[PDB]
Write a protein that binds this ligand. Structure first.
Ligand SMILES: CCCCCCCC/C=C\CCCCCCCCOC(=O)[C@H](O)CO
Ligand SMILES: CCCCCCCC/C=C\CCCCCCCCOC(=O)[C@H](O)CO
Ligand SMILES: CCCCCCCC/C=C\CCCCCCCCOC(=O)[C@H](O)CO
Ligand SMILES: CCCCCCCC/C=C\CCCCCCCCOC(=O)[C@H](O)CO
Ligand SMILES: CCCCCCCC/C=C\CCCCCCCCOC(=O)[C@H](O)CO
Ligand SMILES: CCCCCCCCCCCCCCCCCCCC
Ligand SMILES: CCCCCCCCCCCCCCCCCCCC
Ligand SMILES: CCCCCCCCCCCCCCCCCCCC
Ligand SMILES: CCCCCCCCCCCCCCCCCCCC
Ligand SMILES: CCCCCCCCCCCCCCCCCCCC
Ligand SMILES: CCCCCCCCCCCCCCCCCCCC
Ligand SMILES: CCCCCCCCCCCCCCCCCCCC
Ligand SMILES: CCCCCCCCCCCCCCCCCCCC
Ligand SMILES: CCCCCCCCCCCCCCCCCCCC
Ligand SMILES: CCCCCCCCCCCCCCCCCCCC
Ligand SMILES: CCCCCCCCCCCCCCCCCCCC
Ligand SMILES: CCCCCCCCCCCCCCCCCCCC
Ligand SMILES: CCCCCCCCCCCCCCCCCCCC
Ligand SMILES: CCCCCCCCCCCCCCCCCCCC
Ligand SMILES: CCCCCCCCCCCCCCCCCCCC
Ligand SMILES: CCCCCCCCCCCCCCCCCCCC
Ligand SMILES: CCCCCCCCCCCCCCCCCCCC
Ligand SMILES: CCCCCCCCCCCCCCCCCCCC
Ligand SMILES: CCCCCCCCCCCCCCCCCCCC
Ligand SMILES: CCCCCCCCCCCCCCCCCCCC
Ligand SMILES: CCCCCCCCCCCCCCCCCCCC
Ligand SMILES: CCCCCCCCCCCCCCCCCCCC
Ligand SMILES: CCCCCCCCCCCCCCCCCCCC
Ligand SMILES: CCCCCCCCCCCCCCCCCCCC
Ligand SMILES: CCCCCCCCCCCCCCCCCCCC
Ligand code: NA
Ligand code: NA
Ligand code: NA
Ligand code: NA
Ligand code: NA
Lengths: 273, 272, 270, 271, 271
């Protein structure tokens, strides 16, 4: 019944319920999510000394982000399985009040760790030319926080009030665009003065960044990307968490690995294998 | 509903209940709280060797605080989610007896670890002049203990007895002012004998300490800061936990980072 | 009896139930599973420096795989004990809806981490010759992904739609054969130049790889390997989890140890 | 019908616990295990602050922390599962499904802590006329006997007062022997070291004497005021408060002081 | 009522039930068990560098055994407390279906890690003379696995089929003697060419090994060691888990510590 300002996963769960496939996949993909993060934490810790001292902060901040991501995805995995429970007579999983409603907002507030750190860490690997370290940092952190907070507010209304949903997301999108702007600037300046091999890694980082970060606004909109459409369903629920997981792995783990490799490159006298 | 000497979160949850936003936000913010601490733990451990040996005890102590803060904030997060349970009829979360009442007391007793350590660790980075190490340490430790223990007793009565609440709070404040007094002295003496860049960091630390520590009494009084005011509601519950989380992150993590940076400047190693 | 697209473990659980020996053994073997992985993690971390710097990425990748494996086998172990509950009247464990249906899928998405990593780590130990580092990797990774993803879809139908089960299994099997193809090529190129002890180990790694990886298709089909036969029963359920656990220990822990030993010979003496 | 159970369950089964009694007890158990895990990190991270020959003492502190953390963590959960809130009267009552609460968990775990704590001082100080192995054996035997006898006794703290007292008395005898040996060890360790080192060892002795004596205090607690004030939720709170003060003091502070002594004895200076 | 092929713990628990002391003790001893192992894990990790590089694999293997033993003993502790639940009307803990039946087999399959590793590790400390590393290792691993698997099968029948219980146990014991035979040869060869101090430690390791490992077959038979006798009861239940815990600590931790000490004496380092 009355769900109020809740995520659409609950409305699907309280009305149609989820098939075995939809319920199991979502639980598996979230579990895959946190396993990758913990493993990633290990990777980043064990490779600290593969780069020169001054680049090591980047490994450290990658680890920091792994810790946050693992904790969150682990909790979000337990929340999924607590929120939906098998009805034997129907053969589907339905909303289970005593489990709490499912809410993606857990992710959002944790981005207050992830986003600032991911943006920050590249500043310990590349060299700026025109732009100033503290200034890029502050721009990254202000815009990151605003983006997140406004998106956080909006997602609570994804069902109860489409207008607020779309307005807060548009506002949040403005801050996102600024971030893309500043990061492209940072990538370019970071290319100045370094080896082709290093420039190549930076170019890959920019494509990865652009695509992986754009997946998140995609996950925000997922339920409506097909207009009472195909995605406003358990299919859209699965797709949302799939997109999140692909994005987390890409934006966090792969991103950090590439930065580490750029760092090996820029290090004397170390080279990639 | 007989709740007795319980925090006001339980009275709101037992009467009005919590909206989806109030219950979820409070849970997210408590969850961000403990995630920050475990993340911070890693940071402080992995940066120990960025400062001269004589300063590394500050990093170690920052790490120790992170361990404690993670455990307690993790527990406090679980306390929140099991104390309130969704009612499908009206779509609000209400007090769930079988999960225990919710109490902010976990956090308070955490301070019994953290406060002594956070005040203690700056003494491993700065050098005192006219003050004696042991005498400062002792005043930090005693006044901190009394501040927290008196506040801890007091918060049990925030609803059941407003007079005891305020009187214990008032007493707690007196020890707080003493710690502020002692800390400013430590910071001033620490400025002596070090470079201006170091002095600049200590100034930032003092302002951070001042603002972040004052937030806690703010959180103490939160429900009544608007008088049956606007904050005597789920909004006040949200604001209280938000303020705690900001204060913990500031007084623990940012404080630790600034001390580490100070230790780097003082180290015969530079900043970026 | 409305289970939908669910693993056969649930049908057995919901109809016959499991004997004490069947329920316990399956619980014990899953438990040994995740204990071995955590044990292995510690081993691989502590022996990183036993090889030359350039080989150490393989040790690291082994540790990384152990983390992922421990977490998933631990969860899978809990999935098991949560899904089936003792009935005191007949002395058997039956399906318990409130605990969620049991699904092996946790284990399949684990493979998305482990498979790409395992195939990858060998390239950090041996030298290629005619084919390039990036091309092998990319074929390993693409083929592994497709293998896992098609097998994953297939296992949901292992009872509800036998055809889908077999088709998806076959498609998956194609990418598997492709992987076996590239790998043997990798093993072969890797044998050139190195001492005799090293080629031997590699030959073992290849036998280990071929057997352990073939075990997974066996577990996939287990319940039907005797046709409603002997393995379409709790005995089939025990066998499947026993085979997964042997496979996983072989393909990740034993495989990793050998690669480590190879790296020591190419460095330091055993 | 509770049987040979700790008095906590009798209070919990009849009068119940107030919000403050129940919350405090849970909080103090939680502080306890948090301190232990924090301490584990401290002792590991400071190993290299003393000469190699002293580092075993850090390692043994770490060992004790692992032990104390696990047990206090378990006991914290045991407390909250054993007593459940009753909404009609607003008190927490015994909840059998959670199991009866028992302090005996602590006792068996002292079979790790006690021997390791007594042992570790011998890797920091130097004996003079006494032998390392003899002091070790004395400590270890008396420690085991002290713990086992008390373990047995506490099961009868309500069901059989006489047994409770007799086993406690026997346990105390071994305790007194341990105090005797430790004092001899402290005195010997003072011979030939700097006054800074001697001062610490003196503090270690006072700390050791008070903190260890707190444990028999916790044992007797329900009866320390005779159906008195402490035979109630107040004595339940006090017993756990006392255990936690004792744990932090006997384990952490002790370990920190031994580490400081090791620094003074390292040829490394005390900040 | 209908238990099938289940350990006798479940039969006692379902018929007479467990007293507070029997239930709490068994829980306490299991908790001390996993606590010792995790503490051991730290010790072995933290002492690796106290021996020459060639011997450090023995530490690593000791650590491997600790992780495995902690995990299993922790799981088994939780299974004890969820399999038996308090009945307030009677004052005893009875079988609780929904917690699953209790089974020691968890422990047995865990040995497939510990046994091969414990046997293997001594070969990174001692030097063989006439025997080959590989042959000994293979003999240890094959006989170990067969010992475990045959015993594991046997214990499922400890109540439901005395005949199979003893037959499978007898078979298991055959492989056990073989292991004893091989280990004795390994210890004799390891004594060759080393200082008497080292020889002495090896002699202790042998006695420790002989005794601690033999405790396991004792635990297997425990309920019948006194014939419907004394030990077929909650006392036998207590005794069994006590013996496992003593055995695990001795065979794992103390064994591991002596090997470390042996490694130190052989290291070109002193104890
Ligand atoms: C601090 C942030 C305040 C939240 C404002 C939400 C109103 C934004 O939405 C508002 C609508 O009128 C409610 O559906
Ligand atoms: C330390 C123990 C002090 C407890 C004082 C609590 C009474 C403070 O409580 C207050 C009135 O008793 C209730 O209104
Ligand atoms: C994204 C990939 C879509 C997979 C759909 C497979 C259902 C294919 O199987 C399906 C049943 O077999 C037909 O009802
Ligand atoms: C060794 C274990 C022996 C324990 C004997 C305790 C009964 C000593 O006390 C017992 C009373 O008889 C029961 O109230
Ligand atoms: C693997 C084979 C296990 C056979 C155990 C039955 C051995 O014992 C069996 C009896 O026949 C049932 O009581
Ligand atoms: C040449 C150096 C590059 C080394 C690559 C190793 C990076 C892998 C470590 C990341 C651990 C995360 C687990 C893998 C994620 C794959 C899931 C899709
Ligand atoms: C060589 C030192 C590397 C040690 C890094 C280990 C850090 C642990 C990372 C989390 C994995 C825990 C698994 C549960
Ligand atoms: C010169 C060194 C400065 C490095 C500063 C980076 C410190 C970050 C480590 C703290 C980890 C906590 C997560 C960030 C706080 C999230 C805010 C909400
Ligand atoms: C920034 C404010 C945007 C909130 C939009 C509210 C939508 C009104 C619903 C009619
Ligand atoms: C109300 C619209 C908000 C615009 C956001 C501006 C983005 C750049 C700010 C830095
Ligand atoms: C050598 C280049 C580094 C690539 C980044 C590695 C990150 C792991 C990605 C694995 C992809 C597996 C496909 C599913
Ligand atoms: C270089 C050595 C670094 C060792 C780092 C150990 C950090 C342990 C922190 C625990 C994090 C566990 C996450 C769950
Ligand atoms: C130091 C003790 C102060 C307690 C204040 C109690 C307030 C009286 C209740 C009306
Ligand atoms: C550079 C010294 C300050 C380090 C503090 C680390 C915290 C940074 C996180 C800021 C993100 C904004 C959240 C509001
Ligand atoms: C000698 C120092 C080498 C560093 C070893 C650090 C290894 C820690 C790896 C953690 C593995 C998780 C096991 C914990 C079980 C709980
Ligand atoms: C070394 C790889 C071992 C796998 C072969 C064993 C086959 C297991 C089948 C048991 C069912
Ligand atoms: C020397 C290389 C041998 C590899 C052994 C890998 C460990 C597997 C343990 C086998 C235990 C038997 C059961
Ligand atoms: C000269 C250096 C001395 C450093 C002493 C500080 C070490 C204390 C760290 C122990 C961690 C335990 C947590 C604090 C206990 C607070 C008890 C309340
Ligand atoms: C910089 C090198 C120092 C490495 C020290 C490793 C510290 C790991 C100790 C683990 C203590 C447990 C903390 C876990 C909290 C969750
Ligand atoms: C050098 C002497 C080493 C002997 C092995 C150490 C085993 C520790 C056992 C402690 C027992 C304490 C008594 C209870
Ligand atoms: C060591 C034996 C002491 C046991 C005391 C039992 C008292 C009997 C109850 C009257
Ligand atoms: C060094 C003296 C400090 C004693 C503090 C007592 C610890 C109790 C913690 C609660
Ligand atoms: C400088 C000597 C170190 C003293 C031992 C520190 C142990 C922590 C005690 C803190 C007590 C604070 C009171 C709460
Ligand atoms: C120098 C060699 C002597 C050191 C031996 C002590 C190390 C043992 C630490 C392992 C932890 C186990 C705790 C003792 C077991 C007691 C169980 C009762
Ligand atoms: C001084 C540097 C030595 C590094 C040793 C790191 C030891 C970490 C071993 C982890 C042990 C797991 C204990 C888990 C506690 C919960
Ligand atoms: C010279 C190095 C050779 C050492 C190889 C042995 C290391 C094996 C460590 C793996 C630990 C996992 C437990 C063994 C698997 C048992 C399977 C059941
Ligand atoms: C020299 C022996 C090589 C070991 C081959 C594989 C071992 C598998 C054991 C199970
Ligand atoms: C090796 C097989 C032995 C099984 C014994 C069967 C028990 C007989 C049933 C009566
Ligand atoms: C010098 C003593 C030899 C060690 C024997 C084993 C010690 C067991 C302690 C309990
Ligand atoms: C020296 C002999 C050591 C043997 C230790 C065995 C103790 C087991 C006690 C329980 C046995 C009851 C039958
Ligand atoms: Na569920
Ligand atoms: Na809830
Ligand atoms: Na079960
Ligand atoms: Na409770
Ligand atoms: Na129980």
């Amino acid at each position: 019944q009355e769900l109020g300002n809740a995520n659409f996963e609950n409305f699907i769960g309280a009305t149609e319920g989820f098939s075995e496939i939809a319920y199991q996949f979502t639980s598996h993909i979230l579990t895959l999510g946190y396993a990758v993060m913990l493993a990633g934490l290990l990777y980043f810790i064990l490779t600290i000394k593969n780069v020169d001292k001054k680049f090591q902060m980047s490994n450290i901040l990658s680890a920091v982000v792994m810790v946050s991501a693992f904790l969150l995805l682990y909790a979000q995995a337990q929340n999924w399985t607590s929120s939906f429970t098998f009805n034997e007579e129907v053969g589907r999983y339905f909303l289970d009040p005593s489990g709490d409603l499912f809410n993606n907002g857990y992710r959002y507030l944790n981005w207050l760790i992830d986003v600032p750190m991911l943006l920050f860490q590249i500043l310990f690997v590349v060299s700026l030319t025109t732009s100033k370290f503290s200034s890029v940092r502050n721009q990254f952190w202000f815009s990151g926080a605003m983006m997140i907070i406004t998106g956080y507010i909006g997602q609570f209304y994804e069902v109860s009030n489409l207008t607020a949903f779309l307005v807060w997301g548009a506002i949040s999108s403005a801050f996102f665009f600024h971030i893309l702007w500043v990061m492209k600037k940072v990538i370019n300046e970071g290319k100045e003065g370094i080896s082709p091999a290093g420039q190549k890694i930076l170019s890959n980082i920019w494509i990865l960044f652009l695509i992986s970060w754009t997946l998140y606004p995609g996950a925000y909109l997922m339920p409506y990307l097909t207009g009472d459409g195909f995605l406003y369903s358990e299919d859209g629920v699965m797709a949302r968490q799939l997109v999140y997981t692909i994005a987390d792995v890409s934006s966090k783990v792969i991103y950090g690995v590439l930065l580490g490799n750029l760092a090996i490159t820029l290090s004397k006298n170390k080279e990639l294998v």
